[PDB]
Amino acid sequence: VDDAINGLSEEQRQLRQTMAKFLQEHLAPKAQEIDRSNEFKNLREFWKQLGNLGVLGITAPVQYGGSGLGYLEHVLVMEEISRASGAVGLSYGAHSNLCINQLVRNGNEAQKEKYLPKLISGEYIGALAMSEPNAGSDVVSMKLKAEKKGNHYILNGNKFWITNGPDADVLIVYAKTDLAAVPASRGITAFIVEKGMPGFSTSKKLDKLGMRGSNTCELIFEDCKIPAANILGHENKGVYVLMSGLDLERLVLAGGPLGLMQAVLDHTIPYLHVREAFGQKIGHFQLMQGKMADMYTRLMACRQYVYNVAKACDEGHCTAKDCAGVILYSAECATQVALDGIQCFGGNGYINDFPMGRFLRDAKLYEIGAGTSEVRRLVIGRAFNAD
Amino acid sequence: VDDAINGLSEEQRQLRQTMAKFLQEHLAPKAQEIDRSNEFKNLREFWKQLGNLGVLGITAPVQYGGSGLGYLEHVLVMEEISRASGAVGLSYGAHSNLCINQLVRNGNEAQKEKYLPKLISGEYIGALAMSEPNAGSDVVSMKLKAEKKGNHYILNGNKFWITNGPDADVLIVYAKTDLAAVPASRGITAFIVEKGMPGFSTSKKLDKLGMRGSNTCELIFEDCKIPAANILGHENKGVYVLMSGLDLERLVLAGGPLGLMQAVLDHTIPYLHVREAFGQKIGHFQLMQGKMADMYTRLMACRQYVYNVAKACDEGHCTAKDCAGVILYSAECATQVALDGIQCFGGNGYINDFPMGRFLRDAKLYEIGAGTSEVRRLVIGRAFNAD
Amino acid sequence: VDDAINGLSEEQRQLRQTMAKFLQEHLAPKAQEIDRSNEFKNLREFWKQLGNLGVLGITAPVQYGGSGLGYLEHVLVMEEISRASGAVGLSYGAHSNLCINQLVRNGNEAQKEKYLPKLISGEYIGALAMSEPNAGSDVVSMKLKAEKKGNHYILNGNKFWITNGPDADVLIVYAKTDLAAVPASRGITAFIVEKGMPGFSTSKKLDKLGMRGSNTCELIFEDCKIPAANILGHENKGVYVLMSGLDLERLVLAGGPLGLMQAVLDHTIPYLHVREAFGQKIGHFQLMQGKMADMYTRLMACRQYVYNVAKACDEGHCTAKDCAGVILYSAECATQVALDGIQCFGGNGYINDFPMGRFLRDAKLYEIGAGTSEVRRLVIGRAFNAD
Amino acid sequence: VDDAINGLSEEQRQLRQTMAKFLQEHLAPKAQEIDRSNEFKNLREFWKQLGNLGVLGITAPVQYGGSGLGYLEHVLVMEEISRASGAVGLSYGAHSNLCINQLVRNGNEAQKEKYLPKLISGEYIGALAMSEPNAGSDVVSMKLKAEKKGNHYILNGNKFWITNGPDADVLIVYAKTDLAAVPASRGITAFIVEKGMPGFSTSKKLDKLGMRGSNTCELIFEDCKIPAANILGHENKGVYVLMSGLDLERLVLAGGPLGLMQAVLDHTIPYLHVREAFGQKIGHFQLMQGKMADMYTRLMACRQYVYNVAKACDEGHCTAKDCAGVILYSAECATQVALDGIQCFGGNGYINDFPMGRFLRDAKLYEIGAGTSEVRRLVIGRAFNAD
Numbered sequence A, B, C, D: 001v002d003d004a005i006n007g008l009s010e011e012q013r014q015l016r017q018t019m020a021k022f023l024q025e026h027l028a029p030k031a032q033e034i035d036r037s038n039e040f041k042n043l044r045e046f047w048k049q050l051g052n053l054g055v056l057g058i059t060a061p062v063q064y065g066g067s068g069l070g071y072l073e074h075v076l077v078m079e080e081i082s083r084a085s086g087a088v089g090l091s092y093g094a095h096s097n098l099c100i101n102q103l104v105r106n107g108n109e110a111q112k113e114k115y116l117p118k119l120i121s122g123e124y125i126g127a128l129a130m131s132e133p134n135a136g137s138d139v140v141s142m143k144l145k146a147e148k149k150g151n152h153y154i155l156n157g158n159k160f161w162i163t164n165g166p167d168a169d170v171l172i173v174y175a176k177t178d179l180a181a182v183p184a185s186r187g188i189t190a191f192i193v194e195k196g197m198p199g200f201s202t203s204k205k206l207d208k209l210g211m212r213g214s215n216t217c218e219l220i221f222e223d224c225k226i227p228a229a230n231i232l233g234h235e236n237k238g239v240y241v242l243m244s245g246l247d248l249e250r251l252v253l254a255g256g257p258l259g260l261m262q263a264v265l266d267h268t269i270p271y272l273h274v275r276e277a278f279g280q281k282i283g284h285f286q287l288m289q290g291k292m293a294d295m296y297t298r299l300m301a302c303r304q305y306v307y308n309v310a311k312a313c314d315e316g317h318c319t320a321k322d323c324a325g326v327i328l329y330s331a332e333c334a335t336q337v338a339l340d341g342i343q344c345f346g347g348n349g350y351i352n353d354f355p356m357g358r359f360l361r362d363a364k365l366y367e368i369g370a371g372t373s374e375v376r377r378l379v380i381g382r383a384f385n386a387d
């Protein structure tokens, strides 16, 4: 049960309803297999369905076949997909926000028309690359070179940790066009690379602790020739599209932890009132009643925290410290809650036959992805520093 | 600065502004003295100003001179008074919610007309008595006997821990009218006692750790004769008024922890950017920036949590678990945040010349008053148990 | 390096040394594989090496080829093996403590001579069965029936969650001889079952979150005829051997969390001084220095806690609350430390190529096995209850 | 009763007993008054008694009437006195360690012969001054100027936060002899000032949140003429005596949080088995049993931690990171344990008639005095940075 004390309108309640019911039969039963195999076999198929529901270009203009909604609805879908499968939620998050939302914001009419429609329909998968083997938290120290040869740029180097890497047909890559920029930040440009471009290659998927099924791989660029027309926004003014898209990323991705915390409750609460020890349902012991209370309040507090910040964003009010704040808090709660879920199940929570362990493994990613908890604390503290 | 990302309307923002400005010059300066002396010397005068602002009967019908607003607006005022002074915030809470709100909810036309106007104006001070020396968490085991002698009841016994006790002109007291009730809960009745009634006396103020200035004492009843006309609601159907009031009490009193957390921030943030160690503002060191982030996110999370639950209550959607939830969460956050506030001040946070120590001492109350954290976890756990 | 500020004698420092060097070559390099394949291919061979070193019957009488040492030494070995591989540490614990130690304590001269030698040498593998699908924390509610037919007992029913279950050649099983015992605890007897006894079979190993490699399966008894001579201690007086063995179990198994926290440090410390971000080793940033401090102190405090308690036990002073206290505290520190390890490695900590994720998945078992954190809190609180 | 699982020898157990008994009747009863009045009326007299017991010069050479024992014993004594009174424990700590121990370590035969005997007897009270209004954590930036005029030094400036300040007959002050030293640390000299020296005066005691009764004031030097013969150790080589003293300070002062955590247990345990709610002692409810377990294990862990480190230090093995470690950990545990003590008492824990609130107020000092938790984390992290 999801008490829409969250302050959701009827339409948004309907959105959550539609998603939940759909995912309940199309994604939820596959979740264990996806994680176990580290692969989502129906990925291209699923994306098409997602596009048909209209959730892929949820924040994209109706002009390109988008739904033209806001981040609050985006987090709702994110949260519901993450509830059914953490891996797919992450993949969805890279596609819909990191990629699509970045395109609607900085792409010109041409780029949007050319790319958006297929991204929005699910025919194309999207991804965003900025992280490198030696540039994760310190993203501005990226070394992917982009040499301007006439009306082309020749990219050389590699990207790492890219979600939907080996499946993306369109990708937003950040590269150093001016490696000698006084402030390094003034030497970066964003480019729209496509699957099949000569020189652009991808490595094998990673064997992760969690989010297994969400394909992450290295991107390799060898003399990859990109036409100047594929630059997102403007040359050397890419640190901006990077940074601005990071706030929205943290905002929308906060739905991951929300869906995960929800999922753990979906299992713990019913189990606590079925499993019996010492003559009564384990859920009737104080210690267990306290567990419920804690998991429940953390999920409820984070939900309101994220929902309000998102509503405000849709109103035109977004801030780096507040976007970082919602995910920083949610991420850490998600992990602790998931840790309690396993505890409530006892031995049963410790076996892979139950998804309790999966929620934990998935949850932990969010304290790392979209910026580690440490980098987020810096973002908030610095905000105050500048006041 | 307070970001109304909380989703407050223009009016509500107006309310918070009005309160903040007023409290800043009329209560904030006195706060240290109030705590130190364990006494609010202008209480009566202050109450009439509060009444003039219309915040005493904030949730009371306009008919009796009330504002006719909701719990969200009440939490706002509770928060702002608590920000200025924890002691006075508590006193205000006992008056405006424990007493006044309970009167508007269960009092008949006569009782409301007779008591509400003076309570709303500030001429009268209200209080609510239910706790006893041996009945705090276990409130149902109260043993104040109420003998029915014709058209009167003769109260004999005592009440303990009563806020506004030695100031209340009108008090709502729960007594055991049926000490042999099958389920004890069926033997309790609420009565409206008034200052001056023969038999009814009060003990000396308590010397508490925090909330000094908020008068707490023991109520003594010796053959106090109360007219049957003074029973709140119905005879023996008092456990009910008690329980129902408890939820609204927890919901509205959650503003205390919120105002307290906001108060530590009001001091910590600017201090960290003034005190300098090792050549720079201590607020530039990572450990300090992390502190800010943690205090700030806890405050924001709790703020959205309680505001949204309050909004839902004003829509007619209240629940015991959710009312207990918001305060359980906010209360525990307030204390830790207050602990950090002292930490950030170093030696200075450990001397009484600064209010950092006060914030801690006040904050701790909320983990005990309105039900201990333990009782609140049981409320939530049981809610799930009954599901 | 291990600062033996832990008050270890030269001989004990030597034992640690011997273990560390041996394990570093023989177990550590195969640990990742063991986990990934969920199987220890060299099990039997390894056990014989362990027996050669004399660590299998470490607390067993020299008379049966045991070292004749104490629990402080046993903890050392358990810790070192756990440091190399969590799964094998658990398997070692089951064998050397749960089985062997229980045999040296309650077995008669015959049983000890007939079983101890081969358990001590590594030829045999030992296990202890008490848990059932409906009797984990509530161990007294076990329903494995033991029908006495002449000078034999007919066991019927099953056991669950048995470590070294499919490998044990000798097993200590607790069954209900008197299912109508007034206090149910008066109807339990411990029997030594052997591999190959007709009726007794096992199930397929479990697919667990962590401790993969440590074989856990279900025990099945179908009219398994056990001779009266195989009962450990006395008939119906089994609840006793069970309970007494549980304290020593929790004491010794405390080594697991110790070795796991050490292993985390072994990797995090040097990594923090190799990975560089923003122009410096990440370990030079305050937030990272704080992390080291916390992981370090938690490991150091638990170490002194467990070692001192064990020293006292070897001096004849053991208590249920102190044995439960040692592992309750250590187990919970282990998990959080393990969680910080992943965090310190960033994306690298999140891939199975690194063992950071393994430490987490292994550590969590300790808050479940040997009694959950909840059952341990009860044991301590109850001790004070009786005080 | 403290379980001497702590590995204390017969003689050390006797020291504990002696202290416990003595303090039980001579200090424990006065504790509340001391705190309330922010004054220890019979300080002078008490010191004489402490001296007679031989606990003042506990680690001082028998030659000067000291006991000639080690830090483990000194931690014991510190712990016991803190158990009786936090404020007196601190005062004792400043006298016996900060002052005395430093004198025995860096004072020459003359200085030791002249001051040690009366410091050890109790006839003199000692204090250590290094902190200043703008030099707490950043102690090296102290600005107390010491001009060398022939065979004397003229001190100008002030010290702050000095425990035993108004009572100290002899004080060890650190002052800048070389204000232009390349590394500022090379411009510090420690001096031995006495009460009555022209130019040296003290301000009024501080109104603190806790440790009330332990006199803390500001030192004022105005052309205070100190003979060259009164420098502790060597000119400009004072940062060294300062830094070396800091480790021992942290080690011994860790007894404070230990005594405080024992103190809360001394009250909470029996109270939990006397107060009854819902028909039974509150200590029979799981939530309360859990509380006992938690405060019990934290007290036990920290005890073993600090005891073992102290034993090792007596063996000649001390380290900055380990001395900082024990106090960092103990300090933070004492505060949270004290917080729980208040909780277990309910409303009773919130009044000043009970010491539960005193324990909290006292405890918090240890996360600030002897170096804040932050500076302690830096010390540990840096140690790792160095190797």
Ligand SMILES: Cc1cc2nc3c(=O)[nH]c(=O)nc-3n(C[C@H](O)[C@H](O)[C@H](O)COP(=O)(O)OP(=O)(O)OC[C@H]3O[C@@H](n4cnc5c(N)ncnc54)[C@H](O)[C@@H]3O)c2cc1C
Pocket: A094, A127, A128, A129, A130, A131, A133, A134, A135, A136, A137, A138, A160, A161, A162, A163, A164, A208, A211, A216, A365, A368, A369, A370, A371, A372, A373, A374, A375, C275, C277, C278, C282, C285, C286, C287, C288, C343, C344, C345, C346, C347, C348, C350
């Ligand atoms: C499954 C997965 C999916 C991802 N998907 C994408 C994607 O789609 N696109 C993309 O571009 N990237 C993606 N990434 C990369 C992700 O953004 C980075 O891994 C993350 O920012 C951490 O970087 P790092 O691994 O380089 O860690 P590092 O930067 O090496 O940091 C390691 C540790 O040092 C700490 N640290 C670093 N700097 C500081 C500091 N200043 N102060 C304190 N502590 C500090 C970090 O917090 C962390 O604790 C993904 C990663 C994973 C694992």
Ligand SMILES: Cc1cc2nc3c(=O)[nH]c(=O)nc-3n(C[C@H](O)[C@H](O)[C@H](O)COP(=O)(O)OP(=O)(O)OC[C@H]3O[C@@H](n4cnc5c(N)ncnc54)[C@H](O)[C@@H]3O)c2cc1C
Pocket: A286, B094, B128, B129, B130, B131, B132, B133, B134, B135, B136, B137, B138, B160, B161, B162, B163, B164, B208, B211, B216, B365, B368, B369, B370, B371, B372, B373, B374, B375, D275, D277, D278, D282, D285, D286, D287, D288, D343, D344, D345, D346, D347, D348, D350
């Ligand atoms: C400053 C102040 C103001 C107050 N103002 C008012 C007021 O205006 N009106 C009013 O009527 N009352 C008021 N009270 C009383 C307050 O509601 C009670 O003090 C509170 O409910 C705790 O009760 P107690 O002190 O009897 O604690 P107890 O019930 O004795 O509880 C003591 C400890 O045992 C724990 N415990 C109890 N039962 C259980 C259980 N079943 N499971 C687990 N743990 C349990 C408690 O949580 C606590 O930790 C106030 C109290 C204070 C201190």
Ligand SMILES: Cc1cc2nc3c(=O)[nH]c(=O)nc-3n(C[C@H](O)[C@H](O)[C@H](O)COP(=O)(O)OP(=O)(O)OC[C@H]3O[C@@H](n4cnc5c(N)ncnc54)[C@H](O)[C@@H]3O)c2cc1C
Pocket: A275, A277, A278, A282, A285, A286, A287, A288, A343, A344, A345, A346, A347, A348, A350, C094, C128, C129, C130, C131, C132, C133, C134, C135, C136, C137, C138, C160, C161, C162, C163, C164, C208, C211, C216, C365, C368, C369, C370, C371, C372, C373, C374, C375, D286
């Ligand atoms: C890898 C592994 C290895 C093991 N190895 C062995 C072995 O070698 N031998 C052996 O005999 N057993 C072994 N076990 C079993 C282990 O002892 C049990 O799984 C453990 O005691 C928990 O039991 P359960 O799974 O039945 O949980 P349950 O008893 O169902 O408990 C489930 C949840 O309810 C809580 N709960 C239960 N009772 C209470 C209460 N009174 N108050 C509050 N909360 C309560 C529990 O703490 C937990 O949070 C092992 C288990 C695992 C997973």
Ligand SMILES: Cc1cc2nc3c(=O)[nH]c(=O)nc-3n(C[C@H](O)[C@H](O)[C@H](O)COP(=O)(O)OP(=O)(O)OC[C@H]3O[C@@H](n4cnc5c(N)ncnc54)[C@H](O)[C@@H]3O)c2cc1C
Pocket: B275, B277, B278, B282, B285, B286, B287, B288, B343, B344, B345, B346, B347, B348, B350, D094, D127, D128, D129, D130, D131, D132, D133, D134, D135, D136, D137, D138, D160, D161, D162, D163, D164, D208, D211, D216, D365, D368, D369, D370, D371, D372, D373, D374, D375, D378
């Ligand atoms: C009751 C009491 C007794 C004392 N007794 C004595 C005594 O006998 N003798 C004596 O000489 N002194 C004594 N002191 C002083 C004590 O040593 C200092 O108060 C303490 O070191 C903190 O210094 P400060 O108040 O100047 O804090 P500041 O140095 O201003 O620090 C304030 C905050 O900034 C943080 N901070 C500072 N530097 C850093 C950094 N590099 N990184 C991260 N965070 C940082 C601090 O941790 C703290 O959180 C006592 C103090 C008290 C309150």
Ligand SMILES: CC(C)(COP(=O)(O)OP(=O)(O)OC[C@H]1O[C@@H](n2cnc3c(N)ncnc32)[C@H](O)[C@@H]1OP(=O)(O)O)[C@@H](O)C(=O)NCCC(=O)NCCSS
Pocket: A130, A131, A136, A137, A138, A139, A140, A183, A185, A186, A239, A240, A243, A244, A246, A247, A320, A368, A369, A370, A371, A372, A375, A378, A379
């Ligand atoms: C560490 C952190 C916070 C700060 O970056 P740092 O290298 O210290 O640089 P900053 O000073 O913050 O900013 C660099 C440039 O971007 C600009 N900028 C920063 N934040 C901005 C924002 N929110 N909007 C617009 N511009 C911004 C800065 O103004 C500066 O440009 P100019 O030099 O032209 O003024 C940043 O690198 C970061 O967010 N890292 C995490 C990366 C991440 O989250 N990756 C996730 C990938 S998907 S898992």
Ligand SMILES: CC(C)(COP(=O)(O)OP(=O)(O)OC[C@H]1O[C@@H](n2cnc3c(N)ncnc32)[C@H](O)[C@@H]1OP(=O)(O)O)[C@@H](O)C(=O)NCCC(=O)NCCSS
Pocket: B130, B131, B136, B137, B138, B139, B140, B183, B185, B186, B239, B240, B243, B244, B246, B320, B368, B369, B370, B371, B372, B375, B378, B379
């Ligand atoms: C512990 C706790 C949660 C539960 O009470 P307990 O003694 O176990 O009894 P319960 O079964 O919850 O309820 C007792 C009676 O009240 C009724 N009741 C409980 N909650 C109710 C609610 N929210 N609305 C109406 N009736 C309610 C029950 O139905 C029962 O009446 P019947 O027997 O007629 O059905 C309760 O005593 C409590 O809230 N204690 C805290 C007190 C407090 O908050 N004091 C603050 C004073 S101001 S500092």
Ligand SMILES: CC(C)(COP(=O)(O)OP(=O)(O)OC[C@H]1O[C@@H](n2cnc3c(N)ncnc32)[C@H](O)[C@@H]1OP(=O)(O)O)[C@@H](O)C(=O)NCCC(=O)NCCSS
Pocket: C130, C131, C136, C137, C138, C139, C140, C183, C185, C186, C239, C240, C243, C244, C246, C247, C320, C368, C369, C370, C371, C372, C375, C378, C379
């Ligand atoms: C829940 C818990 C704490 C309490 O058991 P419960 O069923 O309530 O029974 P208890 O009263 O505690 O004890 C039952 C019997 O054993 C005895 N006993 C209990 N603790 C004892 C101890 N430490 N030493 C000796 N005898 C003990 C009791 O005295 C009673 O015997 P009598 O009836 O003859 O007096 C217990 O079942 C337990 O430890 N469960 C966890 C099981 C476990 O740790 N399994 C791990 C397997 S390996 S992962």
Ligand SMILES: CC(C)(COP(=O)(O)OP(=O)(O)OC[C@H]1O[C@@H](n2cnc3c(N)ncnc32)[C@H](O)[C@@H]1OP(=O)(O)O)[C@@H](O)C(=O)NCCC(=O)NCCSS
Pocket: D130, D131, D136, D137, D138, D139, D140, D141, D183, D185, D186, D239, D240, D243, D244, D246, D247, D320, D368, D369, D370, D371, D372, D375, D378, D379
């Ligand atoms: C912040 C902190 C950790 C570091 O000091 P900082 O100003 O950064 O200086 P550092 O580089 O650490 O050391 C300064 C000098 O002392 C020396 N030193 C540092 N630690 C030392 C140690 N443990 N032993 C010996 N010498 C030491 C340094 O080597 C340097 O001398 P040289 O320049 O001659 O080599 C330090 O000022 C400190 O401990 N502050 C807290 C003060 C305190 O605890 N007061 C308690 C009073 S009672 S409440």
